[PDB]
């Protein structure tokens, strides 16, 4: 059965243990901008975790000119062949949520691969007691795709909700 990461920004503490865990898992080093989940804090205390939602029409996969991106048949996650990637940015532009990220000196995009079915970001978030990330099990629902949006938009929405006309 497939999984999807449901995000509750107002429970995010900004601990960024999800970034430490993800980048250590996939890069073997601490590397905030290569984590496949990245937390945006554009105003202190308004923390917005951001990652792939596995759009069923995969705009990123279909935009790639070198076929470096494919879809894992088991998980539905995007899979990056780093050696075919020419860091052209087409997938970055195609993504409704601007999720693909090319960090300095990697020479490839990075995109969440759902840790092959057992997200380590969710586990550490739950272990720390925040539960800003939670797994939903079951078939994909089209509304999932509407969560791919620009993190600056989410940040500004939340700031206005918390602070009102004083923001």
């Amino acid at each position: 059965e497939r999984i999807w990461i449901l995000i509750t920004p107002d429970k995010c503490s900004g601990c960024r243990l999800c970034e430490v865990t993800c980048s250590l898992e996939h890069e073997g080093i601490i590397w905030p901008e290569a984590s496949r989940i990245r937390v945006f804090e554009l105003f202190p205390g308004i923390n917005v975790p951001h990652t792939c939602v596995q759009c069923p029409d995969y705009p990123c996969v279909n935009a790639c000119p070198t076929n470096a991106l494919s879809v894992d048949e088991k998980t539905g996650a995007v899979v990056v062949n780093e050696e075919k990637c020419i860091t052209c940015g087409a997938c970055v532009l195609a993504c409704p949520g601007k999720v693909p990220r090319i960090p300095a000196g990697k020479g490839s995009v990075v995109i969440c691969d759902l840790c092959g079915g057992n997200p380590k970001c969710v586990e550490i978030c739950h272990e720390a007691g925040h539960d800003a990330l939670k797994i939903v099990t079951g078939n994909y629902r089209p509304i999932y795709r509407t969560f791919a949006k620009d993190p600056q938009e989410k940040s500004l929405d939340i700031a206005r909700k918390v602070f009102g006309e004083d923001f």
């Binding site: 503490s13 243990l17 601490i30 590397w31 720390a128």
Partner: protein
Amino acid sequence: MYAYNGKLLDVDLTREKVKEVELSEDVLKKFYGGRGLGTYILWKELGEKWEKVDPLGEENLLLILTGPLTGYYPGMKTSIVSKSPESNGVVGSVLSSELGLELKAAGYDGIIIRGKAKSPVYLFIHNDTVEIRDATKYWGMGGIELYKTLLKEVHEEIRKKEKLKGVPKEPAMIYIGKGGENKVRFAAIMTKLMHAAGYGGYGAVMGSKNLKAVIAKGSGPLPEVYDKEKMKVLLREFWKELFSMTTFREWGTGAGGYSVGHDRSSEPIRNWQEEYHDNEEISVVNFENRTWIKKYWADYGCPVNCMKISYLRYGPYKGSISDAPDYELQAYMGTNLGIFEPEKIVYLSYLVDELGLDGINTGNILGFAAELYQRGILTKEDLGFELNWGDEKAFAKLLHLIVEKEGIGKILAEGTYRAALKISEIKGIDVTKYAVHVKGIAVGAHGIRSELDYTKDISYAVSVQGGDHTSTAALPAKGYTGELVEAFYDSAVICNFVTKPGFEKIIEFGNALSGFNITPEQWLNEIGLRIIHLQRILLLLGGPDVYWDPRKDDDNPPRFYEPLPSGPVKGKAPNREDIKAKVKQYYEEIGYDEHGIPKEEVLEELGIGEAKREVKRIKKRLN
């Protein structure tokens, strides 16, 4: 290089030049990072003319540093080091800015800032790009406006440049408020509204250079580490231990405002006239229910999440934002001023945060002034209004005067020590008996009289950071409380609140990052000891305006020998003769001579024999 980049940025604001300078393995094995590395740079460049260096003049250096554990160990701290406008020594300060992390991911371990810009500037670091930029439009802004304008604008600039690489996370920013801009001697350097490089007056050093802010963004990996598998194992072990500190994660230091006074009788009340109270209004239960809009907030990679955000939607101080507030603000901007009500405390904490003023040395000078008003020494006419205990509106008025250096504010803007000297001369009355400082730095909100707190007898009296309660001395002088171990955390750079694994385990973690083989004994007998000895030397060389003499200034403020007036240990206070005994014993154990001046032989053994030239100048002044 493992764990470090091996590079510092060198920024000359007078000439408007930027270069990279090498950081050698030899220097790093000798001084480690942060506080220790900054103390060495300051002595190397300025030690020969120290007593001529004005901390608010062009010649001072403002150092923004990291250490090998910065970016890998849980939590996040950047080090700030300079010649201090308060003590005329050095303070190893820290604040939970990701600036250190962003620097290391951009390829640098820190920044040497020299000179003075002709008009307000900010420093911009984005990977290989380093620019000095005009900051005239932002001069005068508090932190809230600065995040909404400069920092948002710099993020948008980065986003548009990097469009084909995705959306970068936000840059990190350290900044000053109007208090630093106006060179108030206890102004702080701020980050994220409510975090501070609190002790030392480094906000005035930054303002004296016309530097409004430093903004940094890096998108590369941290340096390689020597033993990555050991690092990951220790990391999991550290997380699991730190997750279990249940009440510290739920409340942070917010239970201090009640607990330190009520349980330990060691909280300043009305300029330390009392140290005990029974008042439940200041309990964390009320801060939480009345003001906390975010109960769990954390800095980069932190499993503790000790931070909280308080915010007022009601009352005359609607719009005020602060943290739990930190216990030191609950004490120094609250009980020290006779104020116990959460709403009032969040208001005054917000003011010092927005103004970029250290809440400890600010609360100290405000309570000093209020005691002088109580005793008839400062009149209503001297102030321009009445300054009663408990009146948060009057204290806010006094803050305004201090930042604008207007009226009495011009005197008070110089800090409690210098202000007490000035007022003593003006009034023909000794008001230094009411000034609660050591070596020019206000005593943090932990007293010694009750002996129920961790501070006792010589904690402040012999420390190279004076009244700084985050770097107190212990007996035995080595041993795992005390200056040598704090020198490690301030050099490692890591947060005190994540050190549950303990000194030895954290040293071992740093070896797994760096490939060094430092032992606890080497830290206590060589590396930390040489850092403390250089700090002692710079502090003893002193001012241009203020000098210390250890035969009178290695001591507690006289109020700390007055018996406690109230509470479960009413009547208690230490005896000055026992303090003198312990001070002489501390000298012996740390390697100072009978007069408290580092022994020339110890300096040679420590590998800083060249500092004998400084010990020699200390002796003719004193003789």
